[PDB]
User: Fold this.
Amino acid sequence: AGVAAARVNSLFYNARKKAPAIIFIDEIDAIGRARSTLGGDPGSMERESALLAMLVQMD
Amino acid sequence: AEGGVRMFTCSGTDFYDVYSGVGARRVRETFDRLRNAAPAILFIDEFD
Assistant:
């Protein structure tokens, strides 16, 4: 746990350090998938954390 | 502006991070800052 958000952080950090740049996240279907209503999954937890980290990083 | 008051703002993301236990101190501190800086209006986007 905490691995996906940290990887997104590392990627966006080394990107913003080298601006201007381009990022290409192929098949975002596994990261930007809609937040479900239920499902107690640590993979769901990591998806939520990666999703909001992505969101705040492009913020 | 027309009310003539200091404006504080936030977002739904920085607070809903999953680092456990951090939210309580965060909201405590931001509200105490509002109180000691009042009057003021806290705008917060995507509250949901």
